[PDB]
Write a protein that binds this ligand. Structure first.
Ligand SMILES: [Mg+2]
Ligand SMILES: [Mg+2]
Lengths: 4, 283, 283, 283, 283, 283, 283, 4, 4, 4, 4, 4
């Protein structure tokens, strides 16, 4: 789960 | 007569300073009084007090801060006897298992030293050298005593900002002004066919996922370019214009390579649908 | 010389018994030894010890339990001097503000009495007569001293099973065998157009809701008739076959009126889609 | 056939409404749609939904709020069949031990009723009628069913705003605009000679107290008229100009009687020293 | 014009006083200044401040305290206008359901009143009149307004010391000196054959119990007559010399009837074994 | 150019794999795809996903698990380029103070490395190399880089299963089937005469202990061979048939040497009493 | 063949003992049975059991304790084969980064070893060698294996009493009798003009500080020489008779150099005021 | 939110 | 469980 | 302790 | 305290 | 903040  | 640790500390430790605002560590990287530290050390404050390992104190100015990398540059007035300096190493040479020496100056009259190894590389350095407050913002040294990172407090696992990151940010922070961090504002996740069908087997999953491989928007953060472009929780991004995608990290790098205030075209399923997002600066 | 409370307790209190399994209150409703109580008092146990306000003890048999209404019937062996009885009132006569007397026999040698009013009617009775353990499973009396409910422990707000509910369940529980509680297994919610569009304005709502008025399936409980019929979180039920619907309670009553092992046809949006659910017994 | 409680509820209960913003109770005091409630019910919101005990719903406007007394006035559109009304009693007739009936309309389809007594009078009413949310903002009735207070949620001890307070605030709130609450901003304490010498016997008390009887400033709240007039923690107020004082409540009443934007001259010891404080509006 | 509660408070409430040591309620039972309260109100302190409902304050002396019953007698100097008095009722007339009025004087300027019923009798009175601090040590009134108990703080269930207990303790406490409370110091339990064999069926019970009916010593409190007589956890007391026994309460009453510094002969199994215990004063 | 740590990691680190079930580390010990890990990593699941440090993924089968030693063997399909292997050292050569390198593969793309020493030997290895999840199930390396243990997560003190234990369990687990762990089911304690008399001096100890030196049964676990043989809390085991005993560990070794489903004769006091216990398999 | 750690442990580890009272580590410093440890290990007890790494046990006498330095000396009866000894190093040679080996004997049959560095010197040693109970009271070794400190339990940062401190305390503790620790009993703080004016800018600071540079008394501990000399919270100490002062540490050293039962003259502002304090022994 |  |  |  |  |  990554934030871009 | 000394271990190699005592030695590395004797080489770089004098440049490790105490930073108070009314707290943490920094280190001088130039005889002109440029000092690196953590942003969470200096707060949003601009007046800072710098104490050298020898006891000299300096009215130091916060020259400003990257919240995203958690780096700040302070400058002090290099009067009297010359400020001592920590020599900068390079972090693209770190292997896991290389020795790691984390040095602080919590009090102002002495270094704190802890010893570990590089535990992980990504681009945070991970080390099992005890990394604690006060010690945070001080340097992470290699066996020779070159700064290879900046300790940050945040198990037995501690983090350091790799020094080459600071090297890229230094000019910009030291001269005021904002480091660019372009983003669009989605919490995303790589979606696996086995995983989309898996998700769709559950009567209680929140949305049906279109069975493909892509980038599942988990959350649209409020007030972001992605909210303004109409992205919704549940969209599956499939390609950035042209190139297909299934990797949240590849999208990260296309967004960063894009720059600030650039339109990106996005391929998503929801129904098929492409949108343009104007990158904005992360804050 | 007494208040009306002392009086009502003198009329029904002798029939209020202590129930232990190794705990709570009950009350005798028939000279033959039929005793009402809470299901959570008697557990899943079948051997129970009944102590009368006078000190006589009886080996009492749990004759069995409705988990859903939380009622159980115990029977004891009416030997010796006649068992005393609480006269049953009727709960369809309760108004809010009517006096309420909650009586227990926690110890076995005395009643506990608390006083309140009917605070709410639905179909749980709500009262501000202190309702506590030990007192739970005992009767809730009106001003004349007729049982109008069964105290249940679970603010200053306590609950009682209205006595007419027990009257309907009594024969069935006292003769072993299961009270029918038909269900399909969905957590549902009435959905308002203002509310569907409201929900759809939020980029982070889990699903788009089809803008109508109906019954939003919030959750499909595992292993239920609704899971087996393919219902999914997010479906909007609109009508039960024929009659349209927007009220979770109206669906409750159609399911109950249907009975056990009956197909119901359901109108839902997801896309339009009707399914049949075989009601099964709630457990 | 009913108790007196059932009766009072039959007289005033129809006027008790449910208030939702996306929550609590109110009651109609005029056939034109004036409704009282708590400020914490309506929030800082201005759109409110009013549900009558009979099921009619009204778009109601928050006409505005006194945070200090925790009163708000809502108005609804008195269409169709006439709005029912709760008759207002008077709270200057309450004795302790008078019966107290607290009525809510949490659901919208029924009243909640609890029963108690007036436990205390100051000028909050205290009652042991269970006072809980949902029920808060509804009326507190006397035995005849006249509103004598407004329930407020905040033991077995609940509070009500005495109805005569609302009567004074009603015109002003119903017509928008701010109720005046003049203050200066000190936390104060009456100081007893036995108490000043007592305090001075302790090596660790924060300040030496000048051995008199007066009003010890315990705290100067930030951004208040008292901070701007230079008052400090530790000052002893002795007189308001002229009249001597030792009672925090007497100072309260001189400040209130003064009004908004009035200079008061203050006699304090710290050293002897008088200051002028410009009363400002409490927020 | 008043309820009966307002009336009872008007009869006994004036005698209800505030007690501070640097806190709780009491009440005057004699025009000479005898005041009852709780022991936990007055602490182990001997100087107490008494405030009458009218505002007169008295230097009152703690005349002393029964920790076991939690009663203390204060005396004040009956100067000026005559002290008002609460008339003492009698607690051997209480039935469950009799009205109960609990009155405090927490502030000193007013009574606090709460209303309930006698919920239980043993020999603590139990009532659902809210019993809270400040109100503790004040009187519990019957419907006529006679003191029938002393509130004690320690659900919706509160306790009062029955007034006849205080009547027996009054002379002794008011004249200094210790109320006798003879004990031997065991935590005990009635043991049932079904229960001894039950206990013995469990491989992990701490001791084998000799299959009888008696008084199982669960704990021997340190420094007690029972420790000095060699009693051990696990002993089963069967008779006090002569009379057989199985009831912890019957042993309680034989110990109390015995008096202070009396040998009791005890029949216990451990092996058969009789011991003599010299009763001592509970502290 | 590297430290010795970087070196040992370069030798064994490639064989350290990530294990997910929907999590932890393992390592390959044979070019045919035999992988060791912790049992708590693989759960009771039988399908596992293995990711090599280079990125190759394998459908791996849980070949099964010893709950007692917390070891499991996975096997993967050794296709394509040869699986890399960690060479096994031997743990009977460990001294305290020998270097210890704990390696994980939490992500799948890199090792995690931490460094410490052997802190204790029993037969768990204790090390101050940070041992954390993800890293658990990976190997513990000596200075040369030989696996000497298996990290297990469970201060600054971490545990490893000594590698020779796994070497004994490997064949059996890799070929399905259960490792034998014979037990009888008592919690026991060595009892010292000074200690039995000590215990007997306390009036509140649960049982009188027969003043000897032996093995005090503290607890009889339910459903064990010891419960079935009638052992009770409080028994003192003195000899296993013949040989006297006072050491819980010596009894451990006689039980293990006995094997599964063997009668043991036991000498215990309670009264003197010998029993036979049929060892059964620990689960 | 061994690391240097295994070696240092082989030199000093045999002298590291287990200490139980019914717990921690110690070490023998003389063939006659003198043993150092922590005071918190031995409690206020005087009988202690010493277990050597080889298994010999000794009735050891607590010869007594310095609570302030947390050191105690035990003596055992050097019978049979000679007691092994740890050679004492010297702590005035420690540099930060020197290797640190912390050794315990928690069980009695083996050492526990952890490895770190000297992290800080003051006069507590700080080390990142894991320092935990059981290990506390054992020795801290340098790389050669000389005791340089005594581990104390009390992050990744542990403390050791520097060995030269114990060397000074040894004779005195081993021969009974009290180590002198003279104090006066104030919690103090260095006060900075910027800081006094800073403090005085805040309306809510407890006291006005006289704008100077000195030693602000923050607290006067009860029953101390400073309370008896009339010192109060808020006093500013400026000089000890003659010599001016602003450093809490310089006052510490003048008090210690003074000795037990010596008058000191103190210059303080409150008003100007000098007092004499009779040093007493810290307890 | 009701359960049917 | 009572105390005597 | 009151607030004015 | 050990388990056998 | 030190103790003397
Ligand atoms: Mg470490
Ligand atoms: Mg009540």
């Amino acid at each position: 789960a990554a934030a871009a | 007569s000394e271990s190699f640790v005592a030695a590395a500390v004797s080489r770089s430790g004098p440049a490790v300073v105490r930073i108070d605002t009314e707290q943490g560590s920094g280190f001088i990287i130039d005889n002109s009084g440029i000092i690196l530290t953590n942003a969470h050390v200096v707060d949003g404050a601009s007046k800072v007090v710098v104490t050298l390992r020898d006891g000299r104190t300096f009215d130091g100015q916060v020259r400003g801060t990257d919240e995203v990398t958690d780096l700040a540059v302070v400058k002090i007035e290099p009067q009297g006897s010359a400020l001592p300096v920590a020599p900068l190493g390079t972090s693209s040479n770190l292997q896991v298992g290389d020795w790691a020496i984390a040095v602080g100056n919590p009090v102002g009259l002495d270094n704190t030293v802890t010893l570990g190894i590089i535990s992980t590389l990504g681009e945070f350095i991970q080390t099992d050298a005890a990394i604690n407050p006060g010690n945070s913002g001080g340097p992470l040294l290699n066996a020779r005593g070159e700064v290879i990172g900046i300790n940050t407090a945040i198990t037995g696992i501690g983090f350091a900002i790799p020094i080459d990151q600071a090297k890229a940010i230094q000019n910009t922070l030291a001269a005021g002004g904002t480091v660019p961090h372009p983003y669009i504002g989605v919490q995303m996740m790589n979606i696996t066919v086995d995983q989309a069908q898996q998700n769709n087997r559950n009567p209680n999953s929140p949305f049906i996922i279109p069975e493909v491989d892509g980038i599942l928007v988990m959350r649209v953060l409020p007030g972001t370019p992605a909210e303004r472009a109409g992205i919704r929780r549940g969209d599956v991004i499939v390609a950035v214009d042209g190139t297909p995608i299934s990797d949240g990290a590849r999208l990260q790098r296309i967004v960063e390579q894009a720059g600030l205030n650039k339109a990106l075209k996005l391929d998503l399923l929801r129904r098929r649908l492409s949108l343009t997002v104007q990158t904005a600066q992360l804050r």
